[PDB]
Amino acid sequence: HWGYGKHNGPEHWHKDFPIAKGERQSPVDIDTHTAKYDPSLKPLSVSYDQATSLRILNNGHAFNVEFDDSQDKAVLKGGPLDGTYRLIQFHFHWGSLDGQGSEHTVDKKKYAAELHLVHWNTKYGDFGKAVQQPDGLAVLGIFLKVGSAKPGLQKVVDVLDSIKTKGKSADFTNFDPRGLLPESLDYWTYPGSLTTPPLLECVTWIVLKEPISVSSEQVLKFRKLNFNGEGEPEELMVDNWRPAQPLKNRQIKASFK
Ligand SMILES: COc1ccc(N[C@H](NS(N)(=O)=O)Oc2ccccc2)cc1OC
Numbered sequence: 673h674w675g676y677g678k679h680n681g682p683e684h685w686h687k688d689f690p691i692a693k694g695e696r697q698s699p700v701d702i703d704t705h706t707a708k709y710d711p712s713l714k715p716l717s718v719s720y721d722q723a724t725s726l727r728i729l730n731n732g733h734a735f736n737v738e739f740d741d742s743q744d745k746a747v748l749k750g751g752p753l754d755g756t757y758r759l760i761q762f763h764f765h766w767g768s769l770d771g772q773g774s775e776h777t778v779d780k781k782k783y784a785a786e787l788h789l790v791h792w793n794t795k796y797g798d799f800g801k802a803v804q805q806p807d808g809l810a811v812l813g814i815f816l817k818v819g820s821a822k823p824g825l826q827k828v829v830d831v832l833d834s835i836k837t838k839g840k841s842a843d844f845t846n847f848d849p850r851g852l853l854p855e856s857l858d859y860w861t862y863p864g865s866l867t868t869p870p871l872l873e874c875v876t877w878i879v880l881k882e883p884i885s886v887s888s889e890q891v892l893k894f895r896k897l898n899f900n901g902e903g904e905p906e907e908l909m910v911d912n913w914r915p916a917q918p919l920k921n922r923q924i925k926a927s928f929k
């Protein structure tokens with residue numbers, strides 16, 4: 673029964689999921705003056721041309737766009753990664769106001785929202801097996817700032833009315849995730865975890881330097897979603913982000929000098 677409120681939010685999660693106070697938790701603050709250029713990083717390859725989106729779902733915490741991951745249709749390779757990682761879904765975290773919403777921060781700076789593209793390591797055969805491994809997942813994180821509209825985000829925005837409440841889903845085929853990327857693929861990378869319960873420490877984080885711009889109108893439609901189920905009292909789906917966690921014994925590396 674976890675959530676983001678006073679009584680079931682991030683400060684409570686450790687009781688059901690003790691790993692919340694683990695050695696490799698996410699998100700983290702990215703101190704740009706402590707992260708180091710790593711020349712050993714190979715180029716990052718985002719290969720989404722044949723992506724096959726299936727559906728969108730309000731899971732009571734965020735909304736998920738899910739993809740067909742039965743083959744290597746949309747994959748992330750290179751960068752810090754060994755092998756091939758298949759896209760399984762994306763989702764966002766966002767705020768009640770534009771001054772907050774992201775999970776990662778950059779020199780303590782909070783963005784309005786954060787996009788998570790979730791991929792699993794094909795050497796482990798399925799997602800469930802992957803989340804039992806220290807290198808099972810790779811998540812591509814993209815910051816959102818408010819300014820001009822993001823054209824590739826509008827189709828997402830325009831389906832949200834049809835999935836306002838928990839448990840609601842809609843057909844969401846022929847959506848191209850390439851329309852959510854910034855120009856530049858400059859990133860920071862570090863080893864971490866899922867930022868939601870069960871907070872598994874299986875993730876290679878790849879966080880893009882360059883934010884994308886979304887319109888106020890677009891983010892306002894995110895804030896119209898509901899945490900609650902149909903016919904329940906309205907709890908707006910806002911501030912579904914986990915704050916920064918201790919870096920502990922970890923190095924954040926930059927792919928750019
Ligand atoms: C196919 O199964 C999964 C797919 C994806 C994630 N990741 C993800 N959160 S995050 N920030 O760690 O990536 O899950 C949630 C959860 C609630 C709201 C929003 C995103 C977790 C999954 O099973 C645990």
Ligand SMILES: [Zn+2]
Binds near residue numbers: 764867
């Ligand atoms: Zn996430």
